[PDB]
Amino acid sequence: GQKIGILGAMREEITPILELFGVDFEEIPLGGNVFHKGVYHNKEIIVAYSKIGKVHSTLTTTSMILAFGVQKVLFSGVAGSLVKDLKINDLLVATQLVQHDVDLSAFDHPLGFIPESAIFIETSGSLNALAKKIANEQHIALKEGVIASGDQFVHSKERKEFLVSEFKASAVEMEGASVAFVCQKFGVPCCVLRSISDNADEKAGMSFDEFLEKSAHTSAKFLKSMVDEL
Amino acid sequence: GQKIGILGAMREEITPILELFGVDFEEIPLGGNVFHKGVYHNKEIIVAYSKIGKVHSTLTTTSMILAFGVQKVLFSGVAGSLVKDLKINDLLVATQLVQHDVDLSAFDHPLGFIPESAIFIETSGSLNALAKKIANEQHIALKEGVIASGDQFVHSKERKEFLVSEFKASAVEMEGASVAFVCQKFGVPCCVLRSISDNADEKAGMSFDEFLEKSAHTSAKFLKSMVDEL
Numbered sequence A, B: 001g002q003k004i005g006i007l008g009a010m011r012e013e014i015t016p017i018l019e020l021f022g023v024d025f026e027e028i029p030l031g032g033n034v035f036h037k038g039v040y041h042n043k044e045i046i047v048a049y050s051k052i053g054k055v056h057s058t059l060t061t062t063s064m065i066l067a068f069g070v071q072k073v074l075f076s077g078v079a080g081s082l083v084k085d086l087k088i089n090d091l092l093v094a095t096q097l098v099q100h101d102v103d104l105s106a107f108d109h110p111l112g113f114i115p116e117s118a119i120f121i122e123t124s125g126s127l128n129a130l131a132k133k134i135a136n137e138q139h140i141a142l143k144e145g146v147i148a149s150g151d152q153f154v155h156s157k158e159r160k161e162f163l164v165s166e167f168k169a170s171a172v173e174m175e176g177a178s179v180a181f182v183c184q185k186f187g188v189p190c191c192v193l194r195s196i197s198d199n200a201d202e203k204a205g206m207s208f209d210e211f212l213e214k215s216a217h218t219s220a221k222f223l224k225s226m227v228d229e230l
């Protein structure tokens, strides 16, 4: 009966989702994005890839909420690990997200902070609960943690160190925080799932190209298991 | 007959606009923002401050377009100068905007570039034309240039140098590019006006606090002159 929004950042991240669902999808173009609207097990699903970055992801999320009236938003994509304990292909659900590249330190504000806002953005307790459930049921080692989002692809131990110490982040990506933020402002529950594609180091660009498709499918697979339970 | 959207980033940047227009404004709250909708000389004007940054400004702009159906968007605020030729209180209208903090260099892309997008975002030719007009008519030395937007308040000659060389930017701020980008995706003409409040150097934070109100009013004043001609 509900309307569920499903997002990815790149076409590659959403292709497996359209497949996995296997239904017929009507394509609606809006604001530079193409939304795939279809029916599935009595639930209306709207799928799309936002394109990379904060601006792109904010726009798409806002459009999905205001134009389609989605009641829940699930995000699927890949991310880079910042901890030894998070490996390639590992799955992770963000508990809190931060915009690691926000800097108003000149006004003596802590990094990541914007007036009239907060440093960390929370995600859905019920969706994250539902993720842990399905994770146990299928023997998947689902991890939890803070995700840092910024408009830079991280590829240096230096930046990695900063993210872990400053924000205690477990993974880094480029759209999580912006998607969760928009959903919070509209009172829409949000879930951010990510699969590790690299280790955000000097070799990050290499590993990313190698595992993009695999990681993308693992994440997409899990996200579908979640929708089957909603 | 038209619907015009007017944006500022901070409450301080929009207070003079509400005053200058002097009409009665109905307050509509949406997505964490408060939109001031009112009638003026037969034109419906929707005013609001987005809050600081790319995510904030993208969300507000998208909401103004999708929920209120604005047909034109005028932005007013302050900015930091990168050139000797641009002084405190000087007025500037952006011809092109760039997101100076986007970095996908790890994939051998030029800075500021995001796949499926472009480095520079163009603004309205007709609105910028109308700005130059009114600028001559009232003896205002209106300048033109490229504006760089990022989620960092710039306060170092070092970053300043980088912005001028990499992007040939004349001024730096935190919302211009995101507002213009959203308007472009929806085919809405956009105009970005800024008044200099500082020189983006080590003393930028000091100068900003000193001139915020003045600069904000100069910009607001001009923006109103523009609406009187629409």
Ligand SMILES: N[C@@H](CCSC[C@H]1O[C@H](O)[C@H](O)[C@@H]1O)C(=O)O
Residues within 6 Å of the ligand: A009, A010, A051, A052, A053, A077, A078, A079, A153, A173, A174, A175, A176, B104, B107, B115
């Ligand atoms: N190699 C691509 C750029 C991917 S940036 C990494 C993306 O993957 C993850 O979803 C991040 O959040 C970003 O959206 C290209 O060169 O187009």
Ligand SMILES: N[C@@H](CCSC[C@H]1O[C@H](O)[C@H](O)[C@@H]1O)C(=O)O
Residues within 6 Å of the ligand: A104, A107, A115, B009, B010, B051, B052, B053, B077, B078, B079, B153, B173, B174, B175, B176
């Ligand atoms: N001193 C304020 C922060 C202003 S950041 C500079 C803003 O002014 C200009 O409009 C920029 O684009 C930003 O929105 C504070 O500490 O809250």
Ligand SMILES: Nc1ncnc2[nH]cnc12
Residues within 6 Å of the ligand: A078, A079, A080, A081, A152, A153, A154, A155, A172, A173, A174, A197, A198, A199, A200, A201, A204, A208
């Ligand atoms: N190392 C990294 N930095 C930023 N976004 C990413 N997405 C996947 N890996 C990433």
Ligand SMILES: Nc1ncnc2[nH]cnc12
Residues within 6 Å of the ligand: B078, B079, B080, B081, B152, B153, B154, B155, B172, B173, B174, B197, B198, B199, B200, B201, B204, B208
């Ligand atoms: N120096 C600066 N950096 C970023 N945004 C600004 N807005 C006004 N001055 C600024």
